[PDB]
Amino acid sequence: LAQQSQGKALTLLDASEAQLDGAATLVLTFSIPLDPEQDFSRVVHVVDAASGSVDGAWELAPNLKELRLRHLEPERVLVVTVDPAVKALNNATFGKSYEKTITTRDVQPSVGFASRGSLLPGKIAEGLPVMALNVNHVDVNFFRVKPGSLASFVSQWEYMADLVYTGRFDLNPARNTREKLLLPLSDIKPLQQAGVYVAVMNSNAATLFTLSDIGVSAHRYHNRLDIFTQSLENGAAQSGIEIVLLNDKGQTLAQATSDAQGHVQLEADKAAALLLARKEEQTTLLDLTLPALDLSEFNVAGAPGYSKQFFMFGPRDLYRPGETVILNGLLRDSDGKTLPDQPVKLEVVKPDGQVMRTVVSQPENGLYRLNYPLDINAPTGLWHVRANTGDNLLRSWDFHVEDFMPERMALNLTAQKTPLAPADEVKFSVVGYYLYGAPANGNTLQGQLFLRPLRDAVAALPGFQFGNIAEENLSRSLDEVQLTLDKGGRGEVSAASQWQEAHSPLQVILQASLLESGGRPVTRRVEQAIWPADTLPGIRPQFAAKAVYDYRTDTTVNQPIVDEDSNAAFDIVYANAQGEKKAVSGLQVRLIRERRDYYWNWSESEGWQSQFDQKDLVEGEQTLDLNADETGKVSFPVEWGAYRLEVKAPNETVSSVRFWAGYSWPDRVTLKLDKANYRPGDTMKLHIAAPVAGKGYAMVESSDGPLWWQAIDVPAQGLELTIPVDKTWNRHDLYLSTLVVRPGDKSRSATPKRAVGLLHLPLGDDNRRLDLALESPAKMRPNQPLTVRVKASVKHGEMPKQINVLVSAVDSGVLNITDYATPDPWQAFFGQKRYGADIYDIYGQVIEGQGRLAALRHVNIIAQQAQPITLNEQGEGVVTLPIGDFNGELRVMAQAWTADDFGRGESKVVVAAPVIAELNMPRFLAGGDVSRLVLDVTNLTDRPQTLNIALAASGLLELLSQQPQPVNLAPGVRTTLFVPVRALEGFGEGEIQATISGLNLPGETLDAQHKQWQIGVRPAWPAQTVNSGIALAPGESWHVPEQHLANISPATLQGQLLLSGKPPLNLARYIRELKAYPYGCLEQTTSGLFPALYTNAAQLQSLGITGDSDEKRRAAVDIGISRILQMQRDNGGFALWDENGAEEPWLTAYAMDFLIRAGEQGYSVPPEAINRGNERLLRYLQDPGTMLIRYSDNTQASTFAAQAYAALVLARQQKAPLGTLREIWERRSQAASGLPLMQLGIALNTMGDARRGEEAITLALNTPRQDERQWIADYGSSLRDNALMLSLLEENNLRPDAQNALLSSLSEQAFGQRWLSTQENNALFLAAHSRQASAGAWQVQTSLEAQPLSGDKALTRNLDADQLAALEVTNTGSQPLWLRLDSSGYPSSAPEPASNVLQIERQILGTDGQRKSLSSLRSGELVLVWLTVVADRNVPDALVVDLLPAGLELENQNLASGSEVQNLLNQMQQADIQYMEFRDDRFVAAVVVNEGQPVTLVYLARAVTPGTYQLAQPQVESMYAPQWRATGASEGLLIVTP
């Protein structure tokens, strides 16, 4: 706005100094708002008439009138000048120049201690730092705290004294400048006397400091506290008494006195804050609530140490919504030994913290397993599996859930295969195209070239490594690719040779992203091999890689290792790219030892870093000769350290392989041990070396508490100790601590008076590791079992018995996303556990630690896991893993375990297909749609191929063209076949089947390639249902009304005939109508689950319903329950569409009711959900204000309904406080229906007061639903209310003569048919379900069968399109006969647009804004689908559904380049949209339609697959008053062209 200032001039109101935010600030105040753009510098300026220019950082307030300048130096003469410009907002401009001089005035004085104090003691403790500003002197009192009330006094501090005043310190700081001055105390005799003192002046007016000789140290554990009291003065070792106190509270928790060693042992958990150590007059304190000593630079990192070790693991940690998460678990003690059988409580936790499933998992032959089906609409993000073993210390297995959107484009990158010489330049062939069979034209490809060392350079010879691993400049980045592509799809990249000196095989890797519209690119990578000679040397170690820990990676890694002082064997070859093995003589084979000399190095911002100087030494050398087809074998004696075997050929080509001979690959107290690794029986030789000689104590400890300790005196030549290893030392969380202290309190040369040393105590054993060798072919063909053979080894001792192995196979791509390391149980049970203790000290604070070092280096996923096998006597086993499709690299993994031992196994299998065939098709099809499918076929073999492709259509789909001719494909070439198909009327799926014959492969027989695609097929027009019924007197006849047949196409025409001897209820109709399209709505999902909850296949088939073998049903119930839980809010309440949506109490009550009912039928639901639900319902009852019912017409009725239902739901659980029920009953007049009164009545009847219950029931049966249908927020109707009331009556067994009459009336009332709500269907089902119509005899003659139909219970029978068109029924029974006939089918002609209350219209525009034809659309073209909905009422539950033509796919983005289009979008921004989802074949939108304001909806759509597609009418309805419907016109057809 700001035009309120229009017509006004611009004058300066006030330019002056002021205190702003505690700082001296210059403020100019103008009359009217200024131009907020930063132009203040060439117009308004300040000038010191002495110093000159100053800070010109002009600031403008939230107000546009005041211009500020912060931080002015005191007592300064400032000249402020305002030039004639400034402009302001209404371009008024300031008149002339305004100059004003001002003095900035002095600052108010201040003084106080820089610190509240510290508990650090001293022998004299001089110098008290103070921050003075313009102050000549300070008076300070000096108190001495009473040794009696000392405790309470100090406890009052942090979270009672005499007086020894001296005071008056002369502080002479410079003017207008805050200086840090110190107060001497050395020349104050009445203060050197030990004790606790407090200074106070008259803003930190007081500080504290202690004088004492007692130097205290403390090690706190999770439940134990060990204290060591020694002297600050005479080295170490001291007695004395000490106490542990509470937080704020000065109350004692425990007391003790030091022994002859200084040690003390106390039991304390939390709250034990202040620690106080006295020796008569001397007293030293320690605040344990402060931060402990930082040990970040020590090797103390690791996993927490638990008594019970629960190792959770699986094939992967990255899943997509829909597929099942697999989890395995192994439970052991603190030394990896078996514990007695016990359960474990596992909970699945989704990102927002809520629990999705809670299982008490039992083990099976020692292995815990957990499968969790992720819902199709599961939240993406970080999930946890939370395990409880009983200690209430929660274990957590993290796993990510992500969803990947398709690429809708294809990029092909190819190279020259055969290696190039360094002289050659490298050129890459690029071919990009759209999936619907169109060249990617003008698409800007952007990528990058990389240079890497090729070591796997010969596929014919696996294991052989090529190239000098020591050669420099083998791994660097090259040029960046930016190619406009231009041509119809094709492009060419090139790379000039920056490599010549290279003596190793190189590879140049292109990584390129193809761009569409700056939205979701298609990235691919390709590599070109480069050799320095047509033939090269190659090394393959005979010894196998062993599993070892890498602290940089923090996971178990395979490395080539041999035993210390041994013989390293190697296979050498002289070979080329193709083929194998050539002749050569005089191969120079050197064994190079890599010697490293480590040394520490200090710096300014690096701190103490561990450096090292390396040197390569030639330990061994041999000379070798090789003939044609020979594998030379060399053996080199090795000792210890890192080696590399180097083979050099006469053509100056080098190949090196690094390996190790040993499994081992200043400001602190350096600790050393005699030998790495121990056992619970040996003895430790501990060497302690400190920079400066001193006294203190060493310790061997863990979590829980210390296992050994000793006070020590370390001279200037180190110290040697001998420590025994008890039998109770088998924890792997053991650490060896050392504390050394310098004698003198004061000294020179700085010297850290405190020195700490801390070393992890090695105790593991390499004899308990199962070494796993996984044998499998490095290459295989898809759709054939992958055979993996396991071979275990142990090195020392015999083969353990009953080795359980758990093999898995996962696509390496999925693993590389998360950098997923193959899980190892060994490192889990025997790995280095963390230092579980906090060190509290009284000496100087820790330096900082700088910090610990780090390290530096749609398609359905293939992810399997076989059952656990058991190896034989030789430790051998075999597993088969059926590989589906897939073309890439599988990482085969295996975890093994016995009772005491554990192991890991890795392997890599390249799954590759000879030829690849991909069929691009639309996301679905509609009956009658003709569509052009694109079949891309590529030949990856080295030979040319003549393939015979055979296509076959199955299901609701047929081919239109003849079979393809035989295709001649050259190596690497791709061809495109067009497959015109048509869909068939019906609801189902169509399958395309492809068979490729020929192939030809020397060495392989190979059965012909088969492939199969499925596609969804739905009728373009909504299903039409027609219901009839009648009562037939004895002798009467009845024929099928022509209404059931007219304008409906046969073969799609179903029908159900219900015959009953009493007023019936269409159970099967309710059930069948409760089986609708997803949409994801809560209530819809819940209502649909009630039938499945109370009907087995036995009962279903009796009604003419088949499918789901009960287990499938129960699984569906589970899926439903998940889908329900995925919408429970954080506060326990539920929402209609999503977890972050508005809250609806009635739905909360509903969902809860279903969940309780589900629990009653043996289905599991996490107690968190149930409990928060019940809490929320209870709060609905006891705090009605928390509710917020939106779009209601009668809030009191809404509230009463919600409260009544909640009351019932809780009352069922015996959790409904009667007082509140009565408190509600005293508001019964607000009820706008009988149902709430009924429910509340049952609640009262349930929780005691039967009288008011019966009253509520009787009243309910005489309280008709009264409301002009607006909302009320009970999702209800007269029908559903009467149904649910009858249901409650029948369920609770109450009034008979009422439920009979009501049942009959309801059966009669059910003739408000054709369009019922899900809630109505559910209610009707609940009514019919709990019904007991008893014996009702009936006989009838029909056209269906020669014999009469007869029964005493109501019978439902199915009818085909013929039986139904010829139906005749005649009662041949003595008594009457009730007959119902329900029909359903799909139209033969497009139906006329209808309308009722709601009105829908659709118009298609172009992105330009103009109207667009749906008969001239080319592929890849965008169109705006403009929907408009209107109604003469307030429809809060309006749901828009716009069926797509298969030729259009939706762009998923809400809100929607300009022009009158924006004038539509805006209107969409004014529409209160509840929910919106862009499906594969639908546009959906939950919205409220207010009276007399049209709802505008626009959504973007892209044309893709060429063809002639059916086009359906728009559709809108009221979800719970579904007689209010509208379908609005259609152009008839959609044409998409290439």
CSV table of C-alpha atoms in Angstrom, one decimal, residues 1112-1368:
chain,number,residue,atom,x,y,z
A,1112,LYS,CA,-4.8,-63.2,2.3
A,1113,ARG,CA,-7.8,-61.7,4.1
A,1114,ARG,CA,-6.0,-61.4,7.4
A,1115,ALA,CA,-3.0,-59.9,5.6
A,1116,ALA,CA,-5.4,-57.4,4.0
A,1117,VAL,CA,-6.7,-56.6,7.5
A,1118,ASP,CA,-3.1,-56.0,8.5
A,1119,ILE,CA,-2.5,-53.8,5.5
A,1120,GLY,CA,-5.7,-51.9,6.5
A,1121,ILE,CA,-4.5,-51.5,10.1
A,1122,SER,CA,-1.2,-50.1,8.8
A,1123,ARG,CA,-3.0,-47.7,6.5
A,1124,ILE,CA,-5.1,-46.6,9.5
A,1125,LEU,CA,-2.1,-46.1,11.7
A,1126,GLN,CA,-0.4,-44.1,9.0
A,1127,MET,CA,-3.0,-41.3,9.6
A,1128,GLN,CA,-3.1,-41.1,13.4
A,1129,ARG,CA,-1.9,-37.7,14.5
A,1130,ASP,CA,0.8,-37.1,17.0
A,1131,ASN,CA,-1.9,-36.2,19.6
A,1132,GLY,CA,-3.7,-39.5,19.3
A,1133,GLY,CA,-6.5,-38.2,17.1
A,1134,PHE,CA,-7.0,-39.2,13.5
A,1135,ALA,CA,-7.3,-37.2,10.2
A,1136,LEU,CA,-9.4,-37.8,7.1
A,1137,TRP,CA,-6.7,-37.8,4.4
A,1138,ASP,CA,-3.1,-37.4,5.8
A,1139,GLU,CA,-1.4,-37.3,9.2
A,1140,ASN,CA,-0.9,-33.5,8.9
A,1141,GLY,CA,-4.5,-32.8,8.0
A,1142,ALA,CA,-7.2,-31.3,10.3
A,1143,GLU,CA,-8.4,-33.4,13.1
A,1144,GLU,CA,-11.9,-35.1,13.1
A,1145,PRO,CA,-13.1,-36.5,16.5
A,1146,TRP,CA,-15.9,-38.6,15.0
A,1147,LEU,CA,-13.4,-40.3,12.7
A,1148,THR,CA,-11.1,-40.8,15.7
A,1149,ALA,CA,-13.9,-42.6,17.5
A,1150,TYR,CA,-14.7,-44.6,14.3
A,1151,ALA,CA,-11.1,-45.8,13.6
A,1152,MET,CA,-10.6,-46.5,17.3
A,1153,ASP,CA,-13.8,-48.6,17.4
A,1154,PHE,CA,-12.5,-50.6,14.4
A,1155,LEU,CA,-9.1,-51.0,16.0
A,1156,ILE,CA,-10.6,-52.3,19.2
A,1157,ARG,CA,-12.8,-54.6,17.2
A,1158,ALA,CA,-9.7,-55.7,15.3
A,1159,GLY,CA,-7.9,-56.5,18.5
A,1160,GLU,CA,-11.0,-58.4,19.6
A,1161,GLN,CA,-10.5,-60.7,16.5
A,1162,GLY,CA,-6.8,-61.5,17.2
A,1163,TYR,CA,-5.2,-58.8,15.0
A,1164,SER,CA,-2.3,-56.9,16.5
A,1165,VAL,CA,-2.2,-53.1,17.0
A,1166,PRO,CA,0.7,-51.2,18.8
A,1167,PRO,CA,-0.5,-50.2,22.3
A,1168,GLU,CA,0.9,-46.7,21.7
A,1169,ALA,CA,-1.8,-46.1,19.1
A,1170,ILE,CA,-4.6,-47.6,21.2
A,1171,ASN,CA,-3.5,-45.7,24.3
A,1172,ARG,CA,-3.0,-42.3,22.7
A,1173,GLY,CA,-6.3,-42.9,20.9
A,1174,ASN,CA,-8.1,-43.6,24.2
A,1175,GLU,CA,-6.4,-40.6,25.8
A,1176,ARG,CA,-7.6,-38.4,23.0
A,1177,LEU,CA,-11.1,-39.8,23.3
A,1178,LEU,CA,-11.0,-39.2,27.0
A,1179,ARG,CA,-9.9,-35.7,26.3
A,1180,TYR,CA,-12.7,-35.4,23.8
A,1181,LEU,CA,-15.0,-36.3,26.7
A,1182,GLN,CA,-13.4,-34.3,29.6
A,1183,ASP,CA,-12.1,-31.3,27.6
A,1184,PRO,CA,-14.7,-30.5,24.8
A,1185,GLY,CA,-12.9,-27.2,24.0
A,1186,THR,CA,-9.9,-29.0,22.5
A,1187,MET,CA,-12.1,-30.1,19.6
A,1188,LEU,CA,-12.5,-28.1,16.4
A,1189,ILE,CA,-15.2,-29.3,14.1
A,1190,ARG,CA,-14.9,-27.6,10.8
A,1191,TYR,CA,-17.7,-26.8,8.3
A,1192,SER,CA,-20.4,-27.7,10.8
A,1193,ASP,CA,-23.9,-26.3,10.8
A,1194,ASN,CA,-24.7,-27.3,14.4
A,1195,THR,CA,-21.5,-27.4,16.5
A,1196,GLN,CA,-23.3,-28.7,19.6
A,1197,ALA,CA,-24.8,-31.7,17.7
A,1198,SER,CA,-21.3,-32.4,16.3
A,1199,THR,CA,-19.8,-32.2,19.8
A,1200,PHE,CA,-22.5,-34.4,21.2
A,1201,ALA,CA,-22.1,-37.0,18.5
A,1202,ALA,CA,-18.4,-37.2,18.9
A,1203,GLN,CA,-18.6,-37.3,22.7
A,1204,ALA,CA,-21.3,-40.0,22.6
A,1205,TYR,CA,-19.4,-42.2,20.1
A,1206,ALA,CA,-16.1,-41.7,22.1
A,1207,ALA,CA,-18.1,-42.5,25.3
A,1208,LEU,CA,-19.3,-45.7,23.7
A,1209,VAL,CA,-15.8,-46.7,22.4
A,1210,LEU,CA,-14.2,-46.1,25.8
A,1211,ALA,CA,-17.1,-47.6,27.7
A,1212,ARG,CA,-16.6,-50.9,25.7
A,1213,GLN,CA,-13.0,-50.9,27.0
A,1214,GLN,CA,-14.3,-50.2,30.6
A,1215,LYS,CA,-12.6,-46.8,30.5
A,1216,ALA,CA,-15.6,-44.4,30.4
A,1217,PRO,CA,-16.0,-42.4,33.6
A,1218,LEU,CA,-19.7,-42.6,34.5
A,1219,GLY,CA,-19.7,-39.0,35.9
A,1220,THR,CA,-18.7,-37.6,32.5
A,1221,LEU,CA,-21.4,-39.8,30.8
A,1222,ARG,CA,-24.0,-38.3,33.1
A,1223,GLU,CA,-22.4,-34.9,32.6
A,1224,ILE,CA,-23.0,-35.5,28.9
A,1225,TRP,CA,-26.5,-36.9,29.5
A,1226,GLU,CA,-27.4,-33.6,31.1
A,1227,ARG,CA,-26.8,-32.1,27.6
A,1228,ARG,CA,-29.0,-34.7,25.7
A,1229,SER,CA,-31.2,-32.0,24.2
A,1230,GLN,CA,-28.4,-30.9,21.9
A,1231,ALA,CA,-28.6,-34.3,20.0
A,1232,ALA,CA,-29.7,-33.9,16.4
A,1233,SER,CA,-30.1,-37.6,16.0
A,1234,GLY,CA,-31.0,-40.8,17.9
A,1235,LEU,CA,-27.6,-42.5,17.3
A,1236,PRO,CA,-25.6,-40.4,19.7
A,1237,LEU,CA,-28.4,-41.0,22.3
A,1238,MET,CA,-28.3,-44.7,21.5
A,1239,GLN,CA,-24.5,-45.0,21.8
A,1240,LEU,CA,-24.4,-42.9,25.0
A,1241,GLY,CA,-27.3,-45.1,26.2
A,1242,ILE,CA,-25.2,-48.2,25.7
A,1243,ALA,CA,-22.3,-46.4,27.4
A,1244,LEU,CA,-24.4,-45.6,30.4
A,1245,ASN,CA,-25.9,-49.1,30.5
A,1246,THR,CA,-22.3,-50.4,30.3
A,1247,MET,CA,-20.8,-48.3,33.1
A,1248,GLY,CA,-23.5,-48.9,35.7
A,1249,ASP,CA,-26.4,-46.4,35.4
A,1250,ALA,CA,-28.7,-48.7,33.5
A,1251,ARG,CA,-31.7,-46.4,34.1
A,1252,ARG,CA,-30.5,-43.4,32.2
A,1253,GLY,CA,-29.2,-45.9,29.6
A,1254,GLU,CA,-32.7,-47.3,29.0
A,1255,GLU,CA,-34.0,-43.8,29.1
A,1256,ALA,CA,-31.4,-42.8,26.4
A,1257,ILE,CA,-32.4,-45.8,24.3
A,1258,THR,CA,-36.1,-45.1,24.6
A,1259,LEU,CA,-35.4,-41.5,23.8
A,1260,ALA,CA,-33.1,-42.5,20.9
A,1261,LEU,CA,-35.8,-44.6,19.3
A,1262,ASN,CA,-38.0,-41.5,19.4
A,1263,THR,CA,-35.5,-38.8,18.3
A,1264,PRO,CA,-35.7,-38.6,14.5
A,1265,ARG,CA,-32.7,-37.1,12.7
A,1266,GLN,CA,-33.5,-33.4,12.3
A,1267,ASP,CA,-31.3,-31.2,10.1
A,1268,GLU,CA,-31.4,-29.5,6.7
A,1269,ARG,CA,-28.6,-31.6,5.2
A,1270,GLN,CA,-25.6,-29.3,5.7
A,1271,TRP,CA,-22.9,-31.3,7.6
A,1272,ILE,CA,-23.0,-31.9,11.4
A,1273,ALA,CA,-19.7,-33.9,11.0
A,1274,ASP,CA,-21.1,-37.3,11.8
A,1275,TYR,CA,-20.9,-38.5,8.1
A,1276,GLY,CA,-24.5,-39.6,8.6
A,1277,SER,CA,-28.0,-40.0,7.3
A,1278,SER,CA,-31.4,-41.2,8.6
A,1279,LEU,CA,-30.7,-44.6,7.0
A,1280,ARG,CA,-27.2,-45.2,8.4
A,1281,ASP,CA,-28.4,-43.9,11.8
A,1282,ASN,CA,-31.4,-46.3,11.9
A,1283,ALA,CA,-29.0,-49.1,10.7
A,1284,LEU,CA,-26.4,-48.4,13.4
A,1285,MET,CA,-29.2,-48.1,16.0
A,1286,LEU,CA,-30.6,-51.5,14.9
A,1287,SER,CA,-27.0,-52.8,14.9
A,1288,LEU,CA,-26.4,-51.6,18.5
A,1289,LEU,CA,-29.7,-53.0,19.6
A,1290,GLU,CA,-28.9,-56.4,18.0
A,1291,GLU,CA,-25.3,-56.3,19.3
A,1292,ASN,CA,-26.4,-55.6,22.9
A,1293,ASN,CA,-29.5,-57.8,22.8
A,1294,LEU,CA,-32.2,-55.4,24.0
A,1295,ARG,CA,-35.6,-54.5,22.5
A,1296,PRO,CA,-37.0,-57.2,20.2
A,1297,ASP,CA,-40.4,-55.8,19.1
A,1298,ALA,CA,-38.6,-52.6,18.3
A,1299,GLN,CA,-35.8,-54.1,16.2
A,1300,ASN,CA,-38.2,-56.3,14.3
A,1301,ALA,CA,-40.3,-53.3,13.3
A,1302,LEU,CA,-37.2,-51.2,12.7
A,1303,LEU,CA,-35.7,-54.1,10.7
A,1304,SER,CA,-38.8,-54.3,8.5
A,1305,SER,CA,-38.9,-50.5,8.2
A,1306,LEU,CA,-35.2,-50.5,7.4
A,1307,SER,CA,-35.5,-53.2,4.7
A,1308,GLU,CA,-38.3,-51.1,3.3
A,1309,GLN,CA,-36.2,-47.9,3.9
A,1310,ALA,CA,-33.3,-49.5,2.0
A,1311,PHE,CA,-35.1,-48.4,-1.1
A,1312,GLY,CA,-33.4,-45.1,-1.2
A,1313,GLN,CA,-30.9,-47.0,-3.3
A,1314,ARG,CA,-28.6,-46.7,-6.3
A,1315,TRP,CA,-26.3,-44.3,-4.4
A,1316,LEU,CA,-25.4,-45.0,-0.8
A,1317,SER,CA,-22.4,-43.8,1.1
A,1318,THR,CA,-19.6,-46.1,2.4
A,1319,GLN,CA,-20.8,-45.2,5.9
A,1320,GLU,CA,-24.4,-46.2,5.0
A,1321,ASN,CA,-23.1,-49.5,3.5
A,1322,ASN,CA,-21.0,-50.2,6.6
A,1323,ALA,CA,-24.0,-49.4,8.9
A,1324,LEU,CA,-26.3,-51.6,6.8
A,1325,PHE,CA,-23.7,-54.4,6.9
A,1326,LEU,CA,-23.4,-54.0,10.7
A,1327,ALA,CA,-27.2,-54.2,10.9
A,1328,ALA,CA,-27.5,-57.2,8.7
A,1329,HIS,CA,-24.5,-58.9,10.3
A,1330,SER,CA,-25.8,-59.0,13.9
A,1331,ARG,CA,-29.2,-59.9,12.6
A,1332,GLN,CA,-30.8,-63.3,13.3
A,1333,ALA,CA,-33.9,-63.7,11.0
A,1334,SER,CA,-34.4,-67.2,12.3
A,1335,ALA,CA,-36.3,-69.8,10.2
A,1336,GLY,CA,-38.1,-68.3,7.2
A,1337,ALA,CA,-39.4,-71.0,4.9
A,1338,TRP,CA,-39.6,-70.3,1.1
A,1339,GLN,CA,-40.0,-72.3,-2.1
A,1340,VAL,CA,-39.9,-71.0,-5.7
A,1341,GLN,CA,-40.0,-72.0,-9.3
A,1342,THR,CA,-37.6,-70.2,-11.6
A,1343,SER,CA,-36.2,-70.1,-15.2
A,1344,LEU,CA,-32.7,-71.0,-13.8
A,1345,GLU,CA,-33.3,-74.6,-13.1
A,1346,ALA,CA,-35.9,-77.3,-13.9
A,1347,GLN,CA,-36.2,-78.2,-10.2
A,1348,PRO,CA,-37.7,-75.7,-7.7
A,1349,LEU,CA,-35.4,-73.6,-5.4
A,1350,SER,CA,-36.2,-74.0,-1.7
A,1351,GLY,CA,-34.8,-72.9,1.7
A,1352,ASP,CA,-35.5,-71.7,5.2
A,1353,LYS,CA,-32.7,-69.1,5.2
A,1354,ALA,CA,-32.2,-66.3,2.7
A,1355,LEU,CA,-30.3,-67.4,-0.4
A,1356,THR,CA,-28.2,-65.2,-2.7
A,1357,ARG,CA,-27.3,-66.5,-6.2
A,1358,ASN,CA,-25.2,-65.0,-9.1
A,1359,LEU,CA,-26.5,-64.5,-12.6
A,1360,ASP,CA,-24.7,-64.1,-16.0
A,1361,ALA,CA,-25.9,-61.8,-18.7
A,1362,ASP,CA,-28.0,-64.5,-20.2
A,1363,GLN,CA,-29.6,-65.9,-17.0
A,1364,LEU,CA,-30.5,-62.4,-16.0
A,1365,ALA,CA,-32.1,-61.4,-19.3
A,1366,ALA,CA,-34.3,-64.5,-19.2
A,1367,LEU,CA,-35.2,-64.4,-15.4
A,1368,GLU,CA,-38.6,-65.5,-14.3
